Design a protein around this ligand. Structure first.
Ligand SMILES: Cc1cnccc1NC(=O)c1cc(C2CC2)n(C)c1C
Lengths: 39, 156
């Protein structure tokens, strides 16, 4: 039985850790809402 | 229940201790999460009850107390921030330039940051702090890593 707790304001924070890449991927979305890689 | 705008953890006690199953966004009195977090189940906010209002397993989205409110879009150019809320750990902004999911029905923003599955539903933000969609539905890549769509609903 699920419950929620507040974890912060939703704010852009200048000088946050910058990381991650920007990959262009070919994908398919099925009726169950699962993404898959098309190759 | 707490109806203050912001980001919230979604917790269960149906397992060992208190387990974080995901995250969501409260905005204009509506709670927004991913379908795979709640499976459409009702939620508690203290002694208050949140009932599902709208849901779609294909979008992997669900809203509580009212219709989907979040309509901001990734501009296709600018960096974004994942406001990650990991299990046991404080809210943290991570800034990133999204990649792109190419599908038969159009292109979608994608973010390549590893976090546990319990982070699913964390909001992705634009430079004005608007929620452009949620993190937690995507694909596993050659590396073994995870890439999440920027999943956004429709406002009516
Ligand atoms: C459980 C589920 C059901 N249906 C669709 C998507 C999911 N999501 C995952 O499987 C998932 C999400 C993440 C992290 C980015 C948050 N990780 C690492 C995994 C494996």
């Amino acid at each position: 039985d699920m419950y929620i707790e507040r974890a912060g304001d939703i704010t852009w924070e200048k000088d946050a850790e910058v990381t991650g890449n920007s990959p262009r991927l070919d994908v398919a979305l099925d009726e169950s809402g699962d993404f898959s890689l098309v190759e | 229940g707490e109806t203050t705008d912001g980001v919230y953890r979604v917790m269960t006690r149906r397992l060992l201790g208190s387990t974080q199953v995901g995250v969501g966004v409260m905005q204009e009195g509506v709670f927004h999460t991913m379908w795979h977090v709640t499976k459409g189940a009702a939620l508690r906010s203290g002694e208050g009850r949140l009932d599902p209002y709208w849901g779609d397993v294909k979008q992997d989205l669900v809203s509580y107390c009212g219709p989907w409110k979040l309509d901001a879009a990734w501009d296709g150019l600018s960096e974004v921030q994942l406001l990650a809320v990991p299990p046991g750990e404080r809210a943290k902004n991570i800034q990133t330039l999204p990649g792109i999911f190419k599908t038969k029905d159009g292109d979608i923003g994608a973010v390549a940051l590893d976090y546990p599955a319990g982070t699913s539903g964390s909001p992705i933000l634009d430079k004005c702090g608007r929620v452009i969609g949620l993190y937690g539905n995507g694909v596993v890549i050659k590396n073994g890593s995870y890439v999440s769509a920027i999943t956004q609903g429709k406002r009516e």
